[PDB]
Amino acid sequence: EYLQITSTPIVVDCATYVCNGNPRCKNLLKQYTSACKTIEDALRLSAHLETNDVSSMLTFDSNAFSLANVTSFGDYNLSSVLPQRNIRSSRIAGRSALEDLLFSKVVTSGLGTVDVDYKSCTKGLSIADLACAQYYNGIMVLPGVADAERMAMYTGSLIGGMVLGGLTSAAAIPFSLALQARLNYVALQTDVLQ
Amino acid sequence: YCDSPFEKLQCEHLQFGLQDGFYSANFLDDNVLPETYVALPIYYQHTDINFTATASFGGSCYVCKPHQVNISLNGNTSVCVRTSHFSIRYIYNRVKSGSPGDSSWHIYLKSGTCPFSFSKLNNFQKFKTICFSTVEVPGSCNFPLEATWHYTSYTIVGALYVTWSEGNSITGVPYPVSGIREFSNLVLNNCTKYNIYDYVGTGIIRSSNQSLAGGITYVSNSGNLLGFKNVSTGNIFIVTPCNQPDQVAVYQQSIIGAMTAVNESRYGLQNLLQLPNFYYVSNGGNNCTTAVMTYSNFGICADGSLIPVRPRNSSDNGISAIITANLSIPSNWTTSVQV
Amino acid sequence: IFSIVNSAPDGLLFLHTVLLPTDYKNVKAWSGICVDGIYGYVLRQPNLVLYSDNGVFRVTSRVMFQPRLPVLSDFVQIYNCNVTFVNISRVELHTVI
Amino acid sequence: VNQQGSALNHLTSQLRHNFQAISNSIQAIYDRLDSIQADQQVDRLITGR
Amino acid sequence: VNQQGSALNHLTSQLRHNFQAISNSIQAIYDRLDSIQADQQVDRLITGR
Ligand SMILES: *[C@@H]1O[C@H](CO)[C@@H](O[C@@H]2O[C@H](CO)[C@@H](O[C@@H]3O[C@H](CO[C@H]4O[C@H](CO)[C@@H](O)[C@H](O[C@H]5O[C@H](CO)[C@@H](O)[C@H](O)[C@@H]5O)[C@@H]4O)[C@@H](O)[C@H](O[C@H]4O[C@H](CO)[C@@H](O)[C@H](O)[C@@H]4O[C@H]4O[C@H](CO)[C@@H](O)[C@H](O)[C@@H]4O[C@H]4O[C@H](CO)[C@@H](O)[C@H](O)[C@@H]4O)[C@@H]3O)[C@H](O)[C@H]2NC(C)=O)[C@H](O)[C@H]1NC(C)=O
Numbered sequence: 066e067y068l069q070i071t072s073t074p075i076v077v078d079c080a081t082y083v084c085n086g087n088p089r090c091k092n093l094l095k096q097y098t099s100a101c102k103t104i105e106d107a108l109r110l111s112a113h114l115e116t117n118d119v120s121s122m123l124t125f126d127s128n129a130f131s132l133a134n135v136t137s138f139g140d141y142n143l144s145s146v147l148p149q150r151n152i153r154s155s156r157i158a159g160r161s162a163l164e165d166l167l168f169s170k171v172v173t174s175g176l177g178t179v180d181v182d183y184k185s186c187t188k189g190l191s192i193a194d195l196a197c198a199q200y201y202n203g204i205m206v207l208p209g210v211a212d213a214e215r216m217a218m219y220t221g222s223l224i225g226g227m228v229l230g231g232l233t234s235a236a237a238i239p240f241s242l243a244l245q246a247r248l249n250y251v252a253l254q255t256d257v258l259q
Numbered sequence: 260y261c262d263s264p265f266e267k268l269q270c271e272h273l274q275f276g277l278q279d280g281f282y283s284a285n286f287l288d289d290n291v292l293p294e295t296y297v298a299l300p301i302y303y304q305h306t307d308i309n310f311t312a313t314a315s316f317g318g319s320c321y322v323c324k325p326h327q328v329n330i331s332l333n334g335n336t337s338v339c340v341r342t343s344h345f346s347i348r349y350i351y352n353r354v355k356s357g358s359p360g361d362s363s364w365h366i367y368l369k370s371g372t373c374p375f376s377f378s379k380l381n382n383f384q385k386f387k388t389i390c391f392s393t394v395e396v397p398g399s400c401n402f403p404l405e406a407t408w409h410y411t412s413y414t415i416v417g418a419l420y421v422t423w424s425e426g427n428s429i430t431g432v433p434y435p436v437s438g439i440r441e442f443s444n445l446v447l448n449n450c451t452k453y454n455i456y457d458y459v460g461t462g463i464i465r466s467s468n469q470s471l472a473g474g475i476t477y478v479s480n481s482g483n484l485l486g487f488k489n490v491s492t493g494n495i496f497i498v499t500p501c502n503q504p505d506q507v508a509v510y511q512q513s514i515i516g517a518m519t520a521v522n523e524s525r526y527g528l529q530n531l532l533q534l535p536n537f538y539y540v541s542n543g544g545n546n547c548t549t550a551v552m553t554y555s556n557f558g559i560c561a562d563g564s565l566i567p568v569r570p571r572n573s574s575d576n577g578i579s580a581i582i583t584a585n586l587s588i589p590s591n592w593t594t595s596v597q598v
Numbered sequence: 599i600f601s602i603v604n605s606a607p608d609g610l611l612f613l614h615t616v617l618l619p620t621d622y623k624n625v626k627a628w629s630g631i632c633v634d635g636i637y638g639y640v641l642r643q644p645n646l647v648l649y650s651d652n653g654v655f656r657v658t659s660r661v662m663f664q665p666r667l668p669v670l671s672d673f674v675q676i677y678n679c680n681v682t683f684v685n686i687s688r689v690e691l692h693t694v695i
Numbered sequence: 696v697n698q699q700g701s702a703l704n705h706l707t708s709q710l711r712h713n714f715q716a717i718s719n720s721i722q723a724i725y726d727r728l729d730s731i732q733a734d735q736q737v738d739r740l741i742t743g744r
Numbered sequence: 745v746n747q748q749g750s751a752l753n754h755l756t757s758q759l760r761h762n763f764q765a766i767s768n769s770i771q772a773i774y775d776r777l778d779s780i781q782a783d784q785q786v787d788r789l790i791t792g793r
């Protein structure tokens with residue numbers, strides 16, 4: 066099942082979109098000084114409110130994170146879900162083995178809403194891209210809060226919480242036993258051998 | 260006074276004193292720019308048109324009306340163009356009496372009913388036929404003529420009658436360049452005012468080398484140019500505007516930092532970082548350990564330095580399981596209230 | 599536990615009341631009693647813990663710590679005795695129940 | 696993703712429509728008429744945008 | 745409360761913008777032109793409002 070939790074923030078510029086950098090519009094927009102003063106803030110207020118709520122749910126745990134390894138899941142081959150550990154960079158955890166297959170499908174075809182870099186739209190030497198074609202009209206796309214790392218620290222702290230039984234400080238019960246406690250909820254198992 | 264880098268933000272937003280937060284800033288500058296012109300191939304042919312006006316004064320009263328005024332086009336009463344380029348002027352003769360007694364009288368053209376202006380006809384405006392004249396003919400707009408003594412009392416003296424018809428054959432020229440065989444011009448590497456294949460705007464034109472076959476004009480989906488191509492060769496060119504907006508942060512009636520897109524210093528700030536998708540320019544230290552402002556994925560603190568945002572710590576213990584081991588069961592309790 | 603309601607500008611303001619643990623206790627749990635190697639007993643309700651400290655057996659909950667004494671009305675017959683049980687003969691069953 | 700793309704594609708496409716004026720590019724309006732007559736044309740685009 | 749206030753503050757502020765007419769006050773329009781010519785002006789404000 067799929068659910069949507071956030072969208073992309075858009076911040077627009079009044080004086081550039083209204084007219085392309087002519088130094089004569091600004092003598093006429095002064096009479097409309099309250100016309101678009103109420104647009105930039107009306108957008109940036111919601112853009113700021115979104116991050117105060119998205120970042121309030123993405124918690125993180127340290128002990129439960131360390132139990133997300135493939136060696137602590139019995140004989141259930143779940144290795145295509147757990148996050149990848151080493152990327153040879155300054156990242157604690159990267160995308161999982163399944164998220165890459167999802168991102169290979171659609172997001173590469175957006176071309177105008179994801180991880181655009183504005184360091185290249187001001188050097189020429191090539192025909193402007195679609196993303197840089199809108200930056201000349203004042204439309205800017207802010208980066209999101211949930212990057213590749215935080216989503217790999219919040220999800221991994223939930224996947225690793227299943228094997229964390231009610232033992233002492235940091236003991237981990239085998240995963241073959243974590244289902245015996247979730248089956249007695251339905252009906253009491255009266256078979257000695259599993 | 261609008262001189263200081265911070266005194267301009269107030270001077271731009273029409274406000275005495277500003278709040279705290281992020282503000283948009285893009286300071287334009289009025290100046291004079293060179294002009295470039297590129298058009299489809301055609302030969303060159305020119306003509307010149309004067310517009311003179313002589314006068315005499317002193318009949319019975321001076322400040323009332325001039326004694327006599329003459330209007331003539333090149334000495335004729337009607338002259339028009341069979342050629343492909345033209346340019347028109349306006350000449351007032353002040354050496355009528357030898358001694359320049361015309362110092363008091365000011366004579367100039369007004370704005371008539373035509374949908375253009377006399378002083379902007381020399382620009383790259385395109386028509387089919389014009390046929391100026393100094394006498395009344397049916398179906399023709401006109402420019403009045405005015406005479407005044409030290410700007411006290413105005414009066415109307417004569418007029419200039421002009422006809423036209425929409426077309427794409429006759430083009431005006433600022434001045435008659437002589438010795439050329441195909442009128443063209445191109446200025447590179449800094450801002451100009453181009454007129455390229457019936458496109459008007461501003462920007463910087465640079466050279467490049469790309470392998471593309473097809474059209475000679477690549478426009479965006481909003482009517483703006485992005486690059487054209489010289490027809491007698493294969494080289495193309497790139498056109499970009501030369502004023503990009505920025506984002507300024509204001510805190511305690513001062514500028515803390517900015518997030519520009521140009522790799523250089525900015526409005527009074529010196530240091531320069533390099534974020535994954537833009538540049539950051541500030542002049543603070545790197546020892547701040549606090550936060551006062553928040554943005555997408557980082558927090559600008561009091562002096563300008565950047566500080567990454569950290570997640571929230573929270574630990575939990577899972578459900579108990581049926582096993583012969585040592586368990587932990589809560590013993591003492593306390594209460595709390597949430598809203 | 600409970601909640602309280604109060605009014606506000608065109609809306610309501612709730613006041614929840616919850617509990618939070620402070621101290622924990624360590625318990626030596628078990629998993630059932632196997633008498634004479636073949637007959638076995640387990641707790642019927644899946645929310646009870648059978649444990650024994652220094653020779654005495656008691657039954658408590660899993661959410662709070664409310665010890666009491668075990669009674670025969672809490673055990674069912676789970677025959678064939680998984681190995682990790684308590685070894686005890688039927689002549690001495692009264693010392694645990 | 697398609698719905699997100701289409702919203703911006705529609706916004707950036709309304710600069711082509713010149714309103715009841717001479718043209719949709721302001722540098723052309725200020726290149727033909729004088730200063731006293733271009734102010735009645737520029738505002739027609741300003742109000743639409 | 746801020747959002748509720750801003751909506752009315754925006755609605756009451758659109759009476760200032762005169763459309764393609766002489767002025768933004770109808771009494772001024774009827775004070776200058778005659779009856780046969782002010783009807784082509786008043787409707788330009790009526791349709792906008
Ligand atoms: C209606 O008329 C239209 C106008 O003419 C016409 O569209 C045009 O179609 C031609 C097809 O011939 C396009 O030609 C370009 O040719 C480039 C040169 O390479 C090819 O052409 C040579 C001569 O024909 C061949 O000899 C050559 O083979 C040689 O080279 C090979 C490689 O070196 C070598 O392996 C061979 O052995 C041999 O030695 C080769 O066949 C070519 O580079 C160019 O590439 C386009 O396609 C590539 C793949 O998609 C892209 O990587 C490249 O960037 C170009 O794609 C762009 O344009 C596409 C169509 O518009 C878009 O779908 C792409 O996304 C991309 O658009 C981006 O870039 C644009 C600027 O380029 C930009 O404006 C966009 O916004 C976007 O950012 C291409 O094949 C010619 O380019 C077409 N015109 C335009 C304007 O694109 C159309 O076909 C006619 N309609 C019908 C029904 O016929």
Ligand SMILES: *[C@@H]1O[C@H](CO)[C@@H](O[C@@H]2O[C@H](CO)[C@@H](O[C@@H]3O[C@H](CO[C@H]4O[C@H](CO)[C@@H](O)[C@H](O)[C@@H]4O)[C@@H](O)[C@H](O[C@H]4O[C@H](CO[C@H]5O[C@H](CO)[C@@H](O)[C@H](O)[C@@H]5O)[C@@H](O)[C@H](O[C@H]5O[C@H](CO)[C@@H](O)[C@H](O)[C@@H]5O)[C@@H]4O)[C@@H]3O)[C@H](O)[C@H]2NC(C)=O)[C@H](O)[C@H]1NC(C)=O
Nearest residue numbers: 188189190191465466467468469470471493494495496497
């Ligand atoms: C489009 O336009 C852009 C710019 O507008 C072009 O970019 C420039 O292209 C020039 C070449 O056309 C580049 O010139 C290089 O100059 C180097 C020496 O310069 C140094 O010294 C001078 C003083 O003498 C100094 O002023 C300067 O600053 C430098 O310090 C040359 O060494 C170099 O040639 C080298 O490479 C070529 C082939 O290059 C191959 O590999 C490239 C990647 O490395 C690849 O991009 C190429 O396409 C190509 O596949 C090679 O032939 C040279 O010598 C070999 O052959 C000899 C035998 O003849 C053999 O003895 C030797 O051992 C080598 O095997 C040499 O290795 C360049 O000529 C200039 O630097 C570029 N500018 C920039 C900013 O990049 C661009 O080329 C144009 N075209 C395209 C398609 O983009």
Ligand SMILES: *[C@@H]1O[C@H](CO)[C@@H](O[C@@H]2O[C@H](CO)[C@@H](O[C@@H]3O[C@H](CO[C@H]4O[C@H](CO)[C@@H](O)[C@H](O)[C@@H]4O)[C@@H](O)[C@H](O[C@H]4O[C@H](CO[C@H]5O[C@H](CO)[C@@H](O)[C@H](O)[C@@H]5O)[C@@H](O)[C@H](O[C@H]5O[C@H](CO)[C@@H](O)[C@H](O)[C@@H]5O)[C@@H]4O)[C@@H]3O)[C@H](O)[C@H]2NC(C)=O)[C@H](O)[C@H]1NC(C)=O
Nearest residue numbers: 184185188520521522523524529530531532533534537538
């Ligand atoms: C945004 O813009 C900023 C600029 O504001 C960019 O930052 C600079 O980026 C440069 C390239 O990325 C950095 O490297 C410098 O490059 C200079 C130019 O060389 C290039 O261009 C020439 C053509 O002009 C080309 O031929 C060449 O191949 C390069 O491509 C270099 O001059 C400069 O050298 C500096 O340092 C040396 C000594 O450095 C050595 O010794 C140091 C200890 O002293 C040691 O720490 C170093 O690691 C190194 O081992 C110095 O000799 C140079 O010249 C000085 O001395 C001579 C006399 O000796 C004197 O005549 C001269 O005037 C100088 O005083 C020179 O100082 C670098 O290699 C550069 O470091 C960046 N600048 C800063 C402040 O970080 C930025 O890259 C841009 N961003 C983007 C994305 O493009």
Ligand SMILES: *[C@@H]1O[C@H](CO)[C@@H](O[C@@H]2O[C@H](CO)[C@@H](O[C@@H]3O[C@H](CO[C@H]4O[C@H](CO)[C@@H](O)[C@H](O)[C@@H]4O)[C@@H](O)[C@H](O[C@H]4O[C@H](CO[C@H]5O[C@H](CO)[C@@H](O)[C@H](O)[C@@H]5O)[C@@H](O)[C@H](O[C@H]5O[C@H](CO)[C@@H](O)[C@H](O)[C@@H]5O)[C@@H]4O)[C@@H]3O)[C@H](O)[C@H]2NC(C)=O)[C@H](O)[C@H]1NC(C)=O
Nearest residue numbers: 232233234236583584585586623624625626627650651652
């Ligand atoms: C469930 O709970 C019950 C009770 O609630 C647990 O029963 C208790 O389990 C404890 C184990 O943690 C027992 O403590 C051990 O006591 C040993 C001594 O007992 C002997 O003597 C008594 C009489 O006094 C006698 O009755 C008994 O039968 C024995 O003969 C200690 O030796 C032992 O210490 C061991 O562990 C420490 C740990 O030190 C650090 O090192 C760890 C890494 O190895 C580190 O991870 C730890 O965190 C810790 O910081 C170690 O230092 C000791 O080393 C000594 O000995 C070596 C030689 O072996 C020597 O070289 C070195 O210098 C030291 O001198 C040693 O290895 C325990 O403290 C306790 O007695 C039990 N009590 C009861 C009533 O049963 C039960 O275990 C729990 N079950 C589970 C699964 O958790």
Ligand SMILES: *[C@@H]1O[C@H](CO)[C@@H](O[C@@H]2O[C@H](CO)[C@@H](O[C@@H]3O[C@H](CO[C@H]4O[C@H](CO[C@H]5O[C@H](CO)[C@@H](O)[C@H](O)[C@@H]5O)[C@@H](O)[C@H](O[C@H]5O[C@H](CO)[C@@H](O)[C@H](O)[C@@H]5O)[C@@H]4O)[C@@H](O)[C@H](O[C@H]4O[C@H](CO)[C@@H](O)[C@H](O)[C@@H]4O)[C@@H]3O)[C@H](O)[C@H]2NC(C)=O)[C@H](O)[C@H]1NC(C)=O
Nearest residue numbers: 130131132133134135136137147148149150151157158221
């Ligand atoms: C789930 O749990 C598993 C648990 O196994 C975990 O996998 C382990 O992950 C850790 C990551 O921390 C790995 O630890 C790494 O070890 C590297 C050392 O191994 C390399 O170097 C060996 C030679 O080093 C010897 O000699 C030097 C002196 O030169 C000495 O200091 C060393 O201590 C050591 O004695 C080399 O033999 C070895 O090659 C083995 O493997 C190959 C196949 O790959 C095989 O062909 C060989 O025959 C040999 O068996 C290997 O090349 C170490 O480099 C690395 O980082 C250290 O060094 C850097 C500097 O480079 C330091 O900055 C850093 O702090 C470290 O000190 C790291 O410590 C461990 O190897 C994994 N084990 C296994 C079995 O995979 C998973 O990650 C867990 N999963 C999740 C999701 O968490």
Ligand SMILES: *[C@@H]1O[C@H](CO)[C@@H](O[C@@H]2O[C@H](CO)[C@@H](O[C@@H]3O[C@H](CO[C@H]4O[C@H](CO[C@H]5O[C@H](CO)[C@@H](O)[C@H](O)[C@@H]5O)[C@@H](O)[C@H](O[C@H]5O[C@H](CO)[C@@H](O)[C@H](O)[C@@H]5O)[C@@H]4O)[C@@H](O)[C@H](O[C@H]4O[C@H](CO)[C@@H](O)[C@H](O)[C@@H]4O)[C@@H]3O)[C@H](O)[C@H]2NC(C)=O)[C@H](O)[C@H]1NC(C)=O
Nearest residue numbers: 312313314315316325326327328329330331352354355356
């Ligand atoms: C704006 O345009 C107007 C229109 O052109 C222009 O007015 C001309 O101004 C020039 C300036 O000098 C005049 O040029 C002179 O012309 C003399 C010939 O004049 C003829 O007409 C005389 C009568 O005309 C007046 O009276 C009638 C009413 O009767 C009135 O409607 C007219 O408007 C005008 O006011 C007439 O008397 C005269 O007769 C002379 O010549 C005959 C021989 O032909 C002789 O027999 C007579 O006895 C008498 O002498 C003639 O018929 C001309 O003589 C004069 O010559 C000068 O130069 C010579 C050297 O070559 C000198 O030796 C001599 O002394 C003179 O200085 C001169 O050329 C022209 O006549 C005006 N046009 C008209 C229609 O009158 C304005 O100037 C323009 N505005 C400005 C600022 O310049």
Ligand SMILES: *[C@@H]1O[C@H](CO)[C@@H](O[C@@H]2O[C@H](CO)[C@@H](O[C@@H]3O[C@H](CO[C@H]4O[C@H](CO[C@H]5O[C@H](CO)[C@@H](O)[C@H](O)[C@@H]5O)[C@@H](O)[C@H](O[C@H]5O[C@H](CO)[C@@H](O)[C@H](O)[C@@H]5O)[C@@H]4O)[C@@H](O)[C@H](O[C@H]4O[C@H](CO)[C@@H](O)[C@H](O)[C@@H]4O)[C@@H]3O)[C@H](O)[C@H]2NC(C)=O)[C@H](O)[C@H]1NC(C)=O
Nearest residue numbers: 542543544545546547548549550560561562563564565566
């Ligand atoms: C990054 O940021 C951090 C923090 O922002 C920064 O740490 C600062 O470092 C600078 C320079 O190293 C410190 O400035 C110096 O402070 C010296 C004294 O500080 C120590 O002593 C304090 C008490 O001393 C007073 O009282 C005693 C009697 O009790 C008396 O004898 C002394 O003379 C003096 O009057 C002590 O409270 C303080 O501890 C701080 O930190 C702890 C936590 O570690 C905290 O719990 C405390 O409450 C307190 O905040 C500290 O241990 C001072 O002597 C020295 O003076 C020099 O300069 C003057 C000119 O100004 C000269 O005249 C003089 O001769 C000396 O040359 C100087 O002022 C500053 O105090 C630190 N700030 C903090 C908060 O610790 C790092 O340096 C930054 N950079 C890096 C790379 O980390």
Ligand SMILES: *[C@@H]1O[C@H](CO)[C@@H](O[C@@H]2O[C@H](CO)[C@@H](O)[C@H](O)[C@H]2NC(C)=O)[C@H](O)[C@H]1NC(C)=O
Nearest residue numbers: 315316317318319320321323324325326327328
């Ligand atoms: C004022 O004086 C002027 C000339 O002194 C009179 O008008 C002109 O008189 C000259 C005489 O040489 C004629 O050639 C012109 O044709 C006259 N001009 C006009 C327009 O008739 C004028 O009549 C005098 N009286 C006034 C102006 O009331």
